[PDB]
Nucleic acid binder design. Structure first.
Ligand SMILES: *C(=N)c1ncn(CC(=O)n2cc3cc(-c4ccccc4C(F)(F)F)cnc3c2)n1
Ligand SMILES: *C(=N)c1ncn(CC(=O)n2cc3cc(-c4ccccc4C(F)(F)F)cnc3c2)n1
Lengths: 707, 707
DNA sequence: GATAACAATGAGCTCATTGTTATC
DNA sequence: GATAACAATGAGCTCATTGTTATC
């Protein structure tokens, strides 16, 4: 065959072809597992072929693209499968079965689904043949019993409860985490680790087409929404069987990947952050990150403490995106950058490696994400360890301020940038009880004009003034247009003899082109008014697909920035009520604690209560009989009054007694002051504290750019 | 020209060729800097060409290798340089000058030296031409003043002292850490950032040849030793000049790289670890690492806390090497492994990515590297932050136990594996005052035989028994022979028709080959006794180049394991004396502190000393007048008796007073017991505590392998 | 004579999924 | 009907230096 990375079976193509099998390995980890496993069986009858990335989607793919596909052509040649032929069986194939050994995660499900879509689309009569298609399943968590899915381990862990302490848990998350002993064990018990997809009814083809057809996007939207809106009716897939159905496989395993794709691509409507960005922000807050550290070190910290399950390179890219601030990017970045994080020249693609760029938290990160609100959000628990919250609750809607664009499965978003000051003013208007003024997208550092061509369709026109010498000077490019891309466009246009010459004086922050064209062409353009039209100085901004996650976790669509603002306003008012209640409770507890401390210190110094040479039980009994309030048999009493008898001897002094009394009175006064403030007042105070800081940030950045 | 990545100057090859310049960029970071810098000058007259890695060494390189060198051929074609021609000037060259823009670190010096060696070797008359060769120098630390070398910043920082608090320091360590503003400034002030090598006398060629000649290895040994054995006569190179000399450049800049290469390749003779391994071990100890974590997370932690200046991939490889335990590897690994860390199949090369392998500290790591000794070692300070010690001091010589092999510049080592038990027995023999028995290399899990051929030249032979059926079964391979390598050797030998057939039953831990050869060939081999000779079952172990760093930091050579053992014994006896003295001092201070605490508590309870409602100054004055010993004006007195008045009110109870008295007596008795023990007794106790653990470790690993 | 094995260093390059919207 | 671009993901692979010492 000559395929570079094919371990073709020795008995492939002969009288034993229908007894052979091909393993569509998902890289090199599965191949390492196979090297040790297949030796424990009839290796002459087993083939292996790794897959580089995610296979091609051959439904929407053109004939040219499919033919120019090394992976697809290689697998077809190995299996002896021809597009033109119509195989009713494995008679003409070089193999009798085709097994897919991918990871036991969402991307493994996607790879299996893509292979199934390939086979079904081109040879639909081969999926109907029992046993032709197969999957290899491996455990992900072991308690040496083996669990093939995370929920089962959680279900088993919950059922066992305190009995898990006697069990040692090993997590085989990636498919490369298993060595040779695991490979031998798995391939000895092949029946337990080999399920063959079975075609029962006509709904299997319908499910495959729906999952992998370009015309069934709305059916996928319904798929994901119905899955996410079920009350325990998810019906997770079990692996104790060996006759997985195609429709069952789709609806129970591919839906998990599609939901995960939507979750990681679509941003929350409250904090505006995706789960990875939220993990980075949460880790940065946990560190109290205020001094720049290498982005790679931050990525390692996030992986260790935020339970990030993906590779560092993705984490580095996420941090870089969080820190970038060029035009067409974050309006108010939450991470400060120190290095080459990318510029408008290449649209943020021209950034140094993570080993060269440093980052920290911006001075305004904690004026938007208030520290107090860290006490009222709900925190996820990914395998016991506490992890990022379900969503942060900033002072202003950061989904609108920073803008986002992501592609899920069934859903995709595009949220432009809006002025933080316009948003703050609208929030104050709502707080006062007024109405909301319309908001159009706003990008910082953009000297052009953004006009609303239609509802949710704006046009940003990069400014270019025609100098009175036959040349045209381009000073600002439209949003989303990069200086190198414009240089390429100008070179291509000159190759067509449309511009005589052009000179570039572009800094990494400002754009300056000078284009000289034929005088006749320039005059015609000026007369027709298409100077900016023909120079690509108008680009679109689409606000017609504002798709996000509401607080309940459902993917919703918003008509424009006003709907987002109103929903955020309601959720944020509720959470400000929660924060005020939490602060009131904490202050009340602190005041009670300090009142008890002052009473104890007075009763000790005054001699009414004596502690010197007192048995622990007797002293605690006396303290209880005196009515002192506990503030966590023998252990319970010791922990209750650890704050009364755990106070250093410094506190039994005139100066320290006076300081403690002052502390109690300060706590009481602060509680009284807080009891007279409503959530609207707290929100207004936060907004008035945040607005001047945003104004100063914009002024400082403008001065830096002008310098 | 058609060179893929050449930004050839527009005026190259014309009447202005001698005014052009070529920048031999060291990759993509320097190219990013150039894109922004060269635009601030006559870009028509400047070319750029990145270099992938370290250039070729064209002295020892054969003609075939040099010709088959895209980099060298590319640069020669770009410059219009032909090997055959003898250029006396830049008249026939397409450029007038050749500038090298590499990082301002040791590897940048190596790249510049390699380019100079190229030019000198092939066209020696071009280095004599003033201004042909040039370098571009950039700052590494800035205090916005710019420093071009780390010592200058340290010298400036020391000179300033407390005045550095008003300065903000930015570290441009890598050459990709500088963006466009830095590039613009550097290429505006080109004279300050462009030094041209000048050829003054005949010593310049001698220095270049010595540094880059295959026969000047001993001259390089003398170079490094003389550099390392100078008392402030290093004469660090300064960049305030613009006429760097070739000999001066070599002896002041390339020597730094050579010394760094030797430092990072040669292991210390005390702890047996190289600086990177020492940093990993130190970071693991700092974490108190006892639960497995991803190797990538460990690498990030080491980079953040051990001031590791290199990339992660190197750190991942170092951790993997520290954890590996296959035959021909660590006898007693200091890091426990959980995953695929590599096997004897590929000699440790078949290990999973750092994202899939977990590691922690082995149960015996802290029985060799005793925690107490952590208090008596000297800790480095790399830019203020405290870093790994100059060397750890284990209980046994881990340089001998684990074996090492590294290549420096001028020096190279090869230390085999010796039995930890033989080493322990020899250490006990020395402690008793006896002599040392000879030691031959020992590898765990090796069933072959290691016999000393000459002084320091051992031969390891794996076991292969000629079964009584015309076939030979190989059950062990010689140290350093990998199962896949042996499979390749057997396939190649069969291709020559020497073995009729062979079958492999090799597990990732044990070897089992069965080779059937022609009966005549087998009979002839048996008669001649060359069965193992012809099957590559004998291999060499060279103990004739045991090169290490003694405690003083000088590279020394040791005749055999006995010299290493004796030197380690002396240093370790000194350090055990240091540890006993430190422990005695700490125990004495603790006993004094606790006796003072008991006196204070007794005085307080008995009423002799009253603290209730006492001014801070008066109480501290009374405590001082009562003779209480401080144990860190107003601040000094407050900190001295923070341990007295900082006692909790718990301590003023019968039970807690009795517990404190018991603690004081326990401390006093422990000090008395320690005062009667000599350093030899402490070392003997440590060795007797370590030996059974090593025996149990070997037994457990043997059982695991057998299973 | 010239390779070959050994370890600590070093970075860009490769392209498919998924949905919207506009050109083409 | 066929491309283009947008972002979150995914891993192998390429080869030089430096010194020793055996075998081709
Ligand atoms: C047909 N035209 C076809 N079939 C399958 N494919 C995909 C393909 O050829 N291919 C996917 C990848 C992915 C990478 C890559 C790039 C960056 C990061 C990671 C990776 C990955 F390998 F891990 F996936 C590189 N090359 C290819 C080739 N096309
Ligand atoms: C002549 N035959 C010649 N001149 C220069 N070179 C070196 C060369 O062609 N080359 C070195 C490298 C290094 C890598 C690599 C591999 C792993 C990690 C990092 C790197 C590095 F790029 F960063 F250096 C890859 N390709 C080459 C090519 N030969």
């Amino acid at each position: 065959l000559g395929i570079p990375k094919l371990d073709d079976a020795n008995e492939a193509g002969g009288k034993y072809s229908h007894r052979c099998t091909l393993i569509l390995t998902e890289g090199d980890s599965a191949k390492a597992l196979c090297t040790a496993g297949l030796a424990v069986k009839d290796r002459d009858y087993f083939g292996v072929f790794p897959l580089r990335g995610k296979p091609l989607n051959v439904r929407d793919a053109t004939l040219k693209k499919v033919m120019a596909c090394a992976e697809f052509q290689a697998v077809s040649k190995i299996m002896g499968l021809d597009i033109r032929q119509k195989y009713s069986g494995v008679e003409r194939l070089r193999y009798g079965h085709l097994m897919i050994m991918s990871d036991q995660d969402h991307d493994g499900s996607h790879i299996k689904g893509l292979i199934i879509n390939m086979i079904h689309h081109y040879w639909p009569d081969l999926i109907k043949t029992p046993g032709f298609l197969q999957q290899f399943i491996t455990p992900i968590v072991k308690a040496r019993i083996s669990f093939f899915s995370m929920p089962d381990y959680f279900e088993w862990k919950n059922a066992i409860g305190d009995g898990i302490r006697n069990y040692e848990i090993r997590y085989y998350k990636g498919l490369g985490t298993s060595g040779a002993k695991e490979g031998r064990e798995y391939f000895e018990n092949i029946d337990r680790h080999r399920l063959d997809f079975v075609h029962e009814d006509a709904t299997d083809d319908a499910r495959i087409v729906m999952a992998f057809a370009k015309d069934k996007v709305e059916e996928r939207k319904h798929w994901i929404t119905q899955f996410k809106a079920n009350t325990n009716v998810n019906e997770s897939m079990n692996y104790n069987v060996r006759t997985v159905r195609y429709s069952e496989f789709v609806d129970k395993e591919l839906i998990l990947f599609s939901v995960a794709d939507c979750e990681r691509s679509i941003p929350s409507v409250i904090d505006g952050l995706k789960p990875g960005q939220r993990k980075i922000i949460f880790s940065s807050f946990k560190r109290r990150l205020t001094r720049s550290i290498k982005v790679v070190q931050l990525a390692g910290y996030v992986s260790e403490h935020a339970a990030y399950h993906h590779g560092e390179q993705s984490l580095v890219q996420t941090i870089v995106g969080l820190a970038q601030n060029f035009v067409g990017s974050n309006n108010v970045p939450l991470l400060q950058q120190d290095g080459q994080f990318g510029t408008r020249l290449q649209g943020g693609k021209d950034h140094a490696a993570g080993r060269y760029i440093f980052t920290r938290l911006t001075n305004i990160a904690r004026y938007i994400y208030h520290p107090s609100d860290d006490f009222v959000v709900d925190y996820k628990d990914d395998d016991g360890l506490s992890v990022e919250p379900f969503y942060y609750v900033p002072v202003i809607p950061m989904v609108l301020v920073n803008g986002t664009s992501g592609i899920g499965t069934g859903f995709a978003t595009n949220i432009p940038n809006y002025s933080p000051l316009e948003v703050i003013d609208n929030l104050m208007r709502l707080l006062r009880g007024e109405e909301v003024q319309p908001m159009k997208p706003w990008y910082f550092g953009f000297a052009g004009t953004i006009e609303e061509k239609e509802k949710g369709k704006f046009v940003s026109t990069g400014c270019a003034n025609v100098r009175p010498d036959g040349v045209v000077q381009i000073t600002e490019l439209p949003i989303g247009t990069w200086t190198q891309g414009y240089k390429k466009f100008l070179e291509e246009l000159r190759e067509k003899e449309v511009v005589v010459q052009y000179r570039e004086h572009n800094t990494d922050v400002t754009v300056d082109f000078e284009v000289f064209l034929h005088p006749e062409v320039l005059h015609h353009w000026v007369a027709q008014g298409c100077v900016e039209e023909r120079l690509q100085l108008r680009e679109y901004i689409h606000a017609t697909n504002i798709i996000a996650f509401d607080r309940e976790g459902q993917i919703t669509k918003y008509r424009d920035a006003e709907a987002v603002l109103k929903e955020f306003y309601l959720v944020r008012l509720e959470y400000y009520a929660k924060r005020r209640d939490f602060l009131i409770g904490d202050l009340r507890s602190v005041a009670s604690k300090l009142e008890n401390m002052v009473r104890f210190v007075t009763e000790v110094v005054d001699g009414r209560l004596i502690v010197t040479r007192r048995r622990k039980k007797e002293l605690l009994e006396e303290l209880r009989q005196r009515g002192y309030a506990p503030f966590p048999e023998m252990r319970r009493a010791a922990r209750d009054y650890d704050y009364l008898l755990g106070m250093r001897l410094w506190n039994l002094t005139a100066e320290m007694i006076a300081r403690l009394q002052s502390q109690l009175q300060k706590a009481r006064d602060e509680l009284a002051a807080l009891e007279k403030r409503t959530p609207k007042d707290l929100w207004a105070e936060d907004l008035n504290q945040l607005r001047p800081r945003i104004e100063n940030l914009f002024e400082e950045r403008a001065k830096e750019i002008a310098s």
